[PDB]
């Protein structure tokens, strides 16, 4: 058994974690990707979905094919990765 923290707490504006899987982007494995729409998604679920498109994956947000046979070809989102936000 493990648990024990404070609730009702959200003050991070950020999208520093993944919307989808909600995990901190890290490099190492769950790198932050950026769709030629602007939603950032790490590579993980990235990855689930380009698998079956062949021709540019589809947004789960806005629908937005982004024609890219590989996964650095999209727009890269250093941005999680950089010392806090880039704008505010
Ligand atoms: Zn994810
Ligand atoms: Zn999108």
């Given at each position: 058994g493990?648990?024990?923290?404070?609730?009702?707490?959200?003050?991070?504006?950020?999208?520093?974690?993944?919307?989808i899987c909600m995990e901190s982007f890290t490099e190492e494995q769950l790198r932050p990707k950026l769709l030629h729409?602007?939603?950032?998604?790490?590579?993980?679920?990235?990855?689930k979905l380009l698998a079956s498109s062949i021709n540019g994956v589809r947004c789960p947000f806005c629908s937005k094919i982004t024609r890219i046979t590989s996964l650095t070809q999209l727009t890269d989102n250093l941005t999680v990765l950089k010392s806090g936000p880039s704008s505010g």
């Amino acid at each position: 058994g493990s648990s024990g923290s404070s609730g009702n707490l959200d003050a991070l504006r950020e999208v520093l974690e993944c919307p989808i899987c909600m995990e901190s982007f890290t490099e190492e494995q769950l790198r932050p990707k950026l769709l030629h729409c602007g939603h950032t998604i790490c590579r993980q679920c990235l990855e689930k979905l380009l698998a079956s498109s062949i021709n540019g994956v589809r947004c789960p947000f806005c629908s937005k094919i982004t024609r890219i046979t590989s996964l650095t070809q999209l727009t890269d989102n250093l941005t999680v990765l950089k010392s806090g936000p880039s704008s505010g």
